[PDB]
Amino acid sequence: SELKKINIIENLIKENNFARAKMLLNNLDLTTLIKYTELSKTITDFCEEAEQADIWRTHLQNFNEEHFSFEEYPPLTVSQLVKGIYFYGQAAECREEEGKPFGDNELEFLKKSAYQHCFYAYNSLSTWAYEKYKMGLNDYSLLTLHYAQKACQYHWTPGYLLFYKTCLNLAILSNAPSLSYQEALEALLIARKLSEHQYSISAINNAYFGKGLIHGNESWDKAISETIAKGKIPSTLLNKIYDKASEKAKGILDEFT
């Protein structure tokens, strides 16, 4: 029984048979393991401790292919990374079955994936909200930028590149696009100032599946120059934006030293 099988691992953790509970947890498929952490406070708390991180790394290493391997980087934990990848994979299968993009099932898995702060989910959800906004639903632009902003909290350069691209797409549909282009420039500059950090290099690996920053979104100076030209950003505001980007990027690089 499902209720009986959960109580078996729950009691092992309560009886302090940690090696025995960890032994049974490793035999589970990822679907059942994740489902147990959702149905049991005892299981999920045990699976979030430091010595249980190898349970998730085994599943993370199963996702690795021949010419691509996922990499870990803070602030996200290894369980958030594995659950986010799994729920996003379930969303991709839901789209294959329904036949249309962003069905109810796919959106449900995308939000569970975004709850684990998966970059793929934030990227796909921002596209979903942008198309909603583009077809006339005005307040969905709020969700579009929110999902891109959350990607900045956890995914370093690819996150800020998503926020930068989201601001460009919102500027296209805006009648006063100056503020959108100014916000796009700041996020674009921050993405460059973070592109050298080790954790951001791993984020670029995961976000674009090892295909690099060029085969995912042309050149740094080319993109910066076109944002300033398209946005008609005056020279007075440039120094303010460059200073804000350097200040916010410095606080990020100092926290991860």
Q: Are 129 and 140 in contact (CB under 8 A)?
A: yes
Distances (CA, A) of 43 to 40, 80, 83, 113: 5, 15, 15, 20
Buried b / exposed e over 122-153, threshold 16 CB at 10 Å, is: bbbbbbbbbebbeeeeeebbebbbebbbbbbe
69 is a domain residue: yes
Name the residue among 96, 98, 97, 90 with its Cα closest to residue 121: 90
108 is a domain residue: yes
What are the residues whose beta carbons fall under 8 Å from the beta carbon of 245, sequence distance 6 or more?
185, 186, 189, 190, 193
17 is a domain residue: no
Please tell me the experimental approach by which this structure was elucidated: X-ray
Residue 177 φ then ψ, to 5° = -75, 5
Distances (CA, A) of 77 to 52, 94, 123, 139: 12, 26, 19, 32
- Within the chain, residue ranges assigned H as helices are 2-14, 18-27, 30-39, 41-47, 53-63, 78-98, 104-115, 119-134, 140-154, 156-172, 178-194, 198-207, 220-231, 235-255
Rounded to whole angstroms, the Cα distance separating 172 from 130 reads 11
126 is a domain residue: yes
Q: Are 203 and 195 in contact (CB under 8 A)?
A: no
Name the residue among 188, 191, 169, 194 with its Cα closest to residue 228: 188
146 is a domain residue: yes
14 is a domain residue: no
Rounded to whole angstroms, the Cα distance separating 167 from 187 reads 9
Residue 209 burial (CB < 10 Å; 0-12/13-18/19+)? middle
38 is a domain residue: no
Task: Give the N- to C-terminal CA distance of the chain in Å, as an integer.
Answer: 48
Rounded to whole angstroms, the Cα distance separating 129 from 109 reads 15
Domain span at residue 103 reads 48-255
231 is a domain residue: yes
Identify whether 75 is preceded by a cis peptide bond (ω within 30 of 0): yes
Q: Which residue has the tokens 């953790």?
A: 13
What's the gap between Cα 29 and its chain centre?
23
Instruction: Taking each helix axis as running N to C, give the angle between helix 53-63 and helix 30-39, from 0 to 180 degrees, rounded to the nearest 10.
Output: 140
Q: State the resolution, in angstroms.
A: 2.3
Sign of the four-CA dihedral 43, 48, 51, 55: positive
Q: How many domains does the chain have?
A: 1
Q: Are 71 and 206 in contact (CB under 8 A)?
A: yes
